[PDB]
Amino acid sequence: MQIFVKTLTGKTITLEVEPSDTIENVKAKIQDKEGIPPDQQRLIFAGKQLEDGRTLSDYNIQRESTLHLVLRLRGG
Amino acid sequence: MQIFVKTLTGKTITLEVEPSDTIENVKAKIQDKEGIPPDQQRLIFAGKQLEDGRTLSDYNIQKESTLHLVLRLRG
Amino acid sequence: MQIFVKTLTGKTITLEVEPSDTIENVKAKIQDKEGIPPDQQRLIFAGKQLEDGRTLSDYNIQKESTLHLVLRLRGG
Amino acid sequence: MQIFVKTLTGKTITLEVEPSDTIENVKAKIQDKEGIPPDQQRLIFAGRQLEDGRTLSDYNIQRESTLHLVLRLRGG
């Protein structure tokens, strides 16, 4: 299924995922499509920060759902 | 001065701040107004999570600027 | 009816409602007021969570009653 | 160390625990001291529901800290 990942600055990317995928996995896909290290990533759904161990099913994330990406890097 | 803190769900609140206010000071004011504990908060500007010991001016956040608030039940 | 929905952290949210208003409706008004997604909230009264579907009248909730709000983390 | 668990109805209960005790471990202690099944307990600290797999030290709950307990309403 397709889902959208957006930053608060406007960048939007699409990703083929499964309801069984973990947030960690999603982060890895974001790394392949955008080169952003998972460590500097923070996925958000419904204003809540997401934890890596859970799956998209757990958060009730359906197809074409939009996930928000925020970067986290020391100093900037 | 005043700045706005918005959630990704529609809510928006205004805060009276000073360029010299740190991010943690802003979290404390959000707590005073919304009751959200500062450790559960994560403030965002220019697409990135801000750091506690930094001031608003360090990030060039000015009057009427907009910060976004996301929650993190750190656990 | 003006009731009060209070978080355990000191925040009070007043709301106009009616005896026939069901639980999900109260959550809807809560969203409009504070933006918190309805599925994200757990309403409390008489020390216990209020189930989806019953109205305020089914719990004898009346004018100026106080309901506590807490967020369920698993999906909110 | 001691910590206090309080219900919204005013029931206060003292528990003996260790910082490394999991929320689930704490619920077992509540059941043995009060008879409430863990599946029906919802523990809270600073307005947020605690995860069963995490420990008290994870939420930095220390000696004499106070938690909240709301019951799982199956039918009322």
- State the shape of chain B: globular
End-to-end Cα distance of chain B: 34 Å
Helical percentage of chain B: 10-25%
Distance N to C terminus of chain D: 34 Å
Backbone CA Rg of chain B: 11 Å
CATH class of chain B: Alpha Beta
The CATH H-level superfamily of chain B is: Phosphatidylinositol 3-kinase Catalytic Subunit, Chain A, domain 1
Figure out the total of helices of chain D: 1
Question: What's the CATH topology name of chain B?
Answer: Ubiquitin-like (UB roll)
Largest interface: C-D, 17 and 18 residues
Round the Cα radius of gyration of chain D to an integer and report it. Answer: 11 Å
**Tally of individual domains of chain B:** 1
Main beta sheet of chain B: 5 strands, mixed
Number of strands of chain B: 5
Secondary structure class of chain D reads: alpha+beta
PDB class: signaling protein
Keywords: ubiquitin, tetraubiquitin, polyubiquitin, Lys48-linked, signaling protein
Assembly: tetrameric
Entry title: Crystal structure and solution NMR studies of Lys48-linked tetraubiquitin at neutral pH
Briefly characterize the structure.
Chain B is an alpha+beta fold. Chain B has one helix at 23-34; strands at 2-7, 12-16, 41-45, 48-49, 66-71. Chain B has 1 helix and 5 strands.
Explain what the structure shows.
- It is classed as signaling protein.
- The complex is a heterotetramer, with 1 copy of chain A (76 residues), 2 copies of chain B and 1 copy of chain D (76 residues).
- Chain A has one helix spanning 23-34, and strands at 2-7, 12-16, 41-45, 48-49, 66-71.
- With 76 residues, chain A is an alpha+beta fold.
- Chain A has a single domain (1-76), classed as Phosphatidylinositol 3-kinase Catalytic Subunit, Chain A, domain 1 (Ubiquitin-like (UB roll), Roll).
- The radius of gyration of chain A is 11 Å and the shape is globular.
- In chain B, a hairpin with a 4-residue loop joins strand 1 (2-7) and strand 2.
- Chain B has one helix spanning 23-34; strands spanning 2-7, 12-16, 41-45, 48-49, 66-71.
- In chain B, strands 2-1-5-3-4 form a 5-stranded mixed β-sheet, covered by helices on one side.
- Chain D has one helix at residues 23-34; strands at residues 2-7, 12-16, 41-45, 48-49, 66-71.
- Chain D has 76 residues and is an alpha+beta fold.
- Chain D is globular.
- Chain D is built from 1 helix and 5 strands.
- Chain D has a 5-stranded mixed β-sheet with strand order 2-1-5-3-4, with helices on one face.
- Chains C and D meet through strand 4 and strand 5 of C and strand 4 and strand 5 of D.
